[PDB]
Amino acid sequence: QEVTLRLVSAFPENGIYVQRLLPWIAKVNAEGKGVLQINFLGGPKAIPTFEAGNAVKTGVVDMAMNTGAFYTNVMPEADFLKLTQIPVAEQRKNGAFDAINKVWNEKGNTQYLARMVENQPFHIYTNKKIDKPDLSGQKIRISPVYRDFFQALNANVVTTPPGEVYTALERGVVDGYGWPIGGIFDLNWQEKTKFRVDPGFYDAEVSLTMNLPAYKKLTDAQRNYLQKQLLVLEAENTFWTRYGNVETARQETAGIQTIKFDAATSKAFREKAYEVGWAGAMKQSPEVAARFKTLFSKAENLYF
Ligand SMILES: O=C(O)C(=O)c1ccccc1
């Protein structure tokens, strides 16, 4: 009557996401004896980064900490969560969360459990200075998050998992990379980064997901306990605020220079990101993308 769920991380273990994950797992275990436990199996060494989505779908493992950008091979819609412009607490209340889960269930045999990273905008990082919002001539590491936007900026893109980024930079295979504001020091990337472009765009999605049959097999007691603890994890998303501010300062102190544009240019830059971001989602999955777009913003925010 105690269930043990096996969880893998699609992100490197020395990263902030795993560092946030591990204490939460420890709490789940300490407070769930006789009910529910989580066995953390480790990171990309356990199941490759881009295959963790498939492992969850087919029940090779029960759970993952992952971003939908890493499992577009399960469903193209997986990458759409970068486009949320309300936090997950508000998603649970306005229909966005439910809609995400229903798509995850139907298209990926996966239950969408919780979002444990938000308020972490993405940025371009590079070693080649720019004064315009154009990446012409630059070779930029990406995942699906940045593909549509970086190509619109005329970048030559190359896909790698997070674990390969340092190597690509050291060997000069790329001039830069996409990543959130936070976390570039974890794998020592600051050593090979000279600039961050502002402003940020989209919002990093890192979430817990679960094999759907496994989820349905939980008893009410186990599910309710899991749910209680998932809400605890999300409640700590206020952390991402300080983290973004601190990481921003850390970059300045380590000699990384911020590239800035004027108000009009910055505004257009972000609008372009979302404009091409949504166009891409609409091309891949028109019905779902339209449903999400409606629920991913609040009216009173639209103008601002
Ligand atoms: O740059 C990435 O690998 C990426 O897709 C991502 C997504 C969420 C958080 C951090 C990175």
Swiss-Prot record:
Gene3D superfamilies: Bacterial extracellular solute-binding protein, family 7. One of its GO terms (biological process) is transmembrane transport. InterPro entries: DctP_fam, TRAP_DctP_sf. GO terms for cellular component: periplasmic space. Keywords: Periplasm, Signal, Transport. Phenylglyoxylate binds at residues 141-146. It is found in: Periplasm. The keyword Iron does not apply. Its main location: periplasm. It holds the Pfam family DctP. The keyword Transport applies. Belongs to the bacterial solute-binding protein 7 family. Solute-binding protein that binds phenylglyoxylate (in vitro). Probably part of a tripartite ATP-independent periplasmic (TRAP) transport system that mediates solute transport into the cytoplasm. The complex is comprised of an extracytoplasmic solute-binding protein and a heteromeric permease formed by two transmembrane proteins. PANTHER family: EXTRACYTOPLASMIC SOLUTE RECEPTOR PROTEIN, PTHR33376. This is Solute-binding protein Bpro_4736.
